[PDB]
Symmetry: none
């Protein structure tokens, strides 16, 4: 429950407090041409973009109610992680996804770098009761390793049918092999 | 998950129950306060109480949730169907939990045989370990899914297996 409170509205979507000073979101949900965030002058905030992943480091602790969480680049392939989907209508909707590889994907009429995954609701994630909607962007992907929670990125894209989702990650590089 | 469906879920005993129609209320058997004389002030003897296992179906003698329309109620879901447990928590959260329905089954809990349709939460690797599944207090919440443009309730929550993703939905016998 304290994990759900790290998820707040941000631009056209959401964002996640990894720590009191570190906030992550999707790049295409950020308000463009912003003078501040949360009243902190933009010049004092460290804005790191990579692909569709956006990291904001604030000059002083600001979400001081939370503890710092582990933020890793992706999740190991095969891991079943959780999208913590928050909806404007109040629902807290955790959805399991099976993670694949980092790659460069043609999806939602554009080109998106990130880690691919597939919702366990699979075939019928075309419904927003059982899948993603645009506007869920910025919501965090997490999983449990031992007793630790690990956040691996945030939501940023999905295929029309809903099954395939894309997690924007901090530095994603996939290795493959011609077989 | 429209509001008009969530509002059908109300507290009942140590859990919840669900208004299917203005006169029909469903819940999990074990959650009902024993030795009650009334429900919502309606004398028990005026209420038709039909129990089948952990499934309880109460028909009230007069309409009482007159704001709701009559919903489709069915005896479980076809195996492999993906549904949603509409979980309400006493601290006010609405948590829809996706699940895939399996077959009917039986488990011995506290020495007694408890049965129903089984399902697996699709909310994470291990739902109970991440606190992303059900919990004591949740029994009676409805399992729902959408067939075409109709919402269908298939039963209510009654039990879950410790340390995993498996849940038991009590269905109409």
């Amino acid at each position: 429950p304290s994990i759900w409170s790290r998820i707040v509205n941000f631009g056209s979507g959401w964002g996640f407090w990894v720590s009191p000073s570190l906030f992550i979101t999707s790049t295409h949900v950020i308000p463009q041409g912003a003078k501040e965030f949360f009243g902190v002058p933009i010049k004092q905030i460290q804005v790191h973009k990579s692909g569709e992943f956006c990291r904001l480091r604030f000059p002083k602790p600001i979400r001081t109610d939370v503890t710092g969480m582990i933020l890793e680049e992706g999740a190991p392939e095969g891991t079943v992680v959780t999208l913590l989907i928050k909806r404007s209508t109040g629902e807290l909707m955790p959805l399991a996804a099976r993670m694949g590889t980092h790659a460069t994907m043609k999806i939602q009429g554009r080109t998106v770098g990130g880690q691919m995954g597939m919702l366990l609701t699979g075939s019928n994630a075309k419904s927003m009761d059982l899948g993603t909607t645009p506007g869920d962007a910025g919501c965090p992907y997490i999983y449990k390793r031992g007793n630790d929670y690990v956040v691996i990125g945030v939501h940023t894209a999905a295929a029309r049918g809903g099954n395939t989702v894309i997690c924007a990650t901090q530095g994603g590089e996939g290795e493959a092999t011609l077989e």
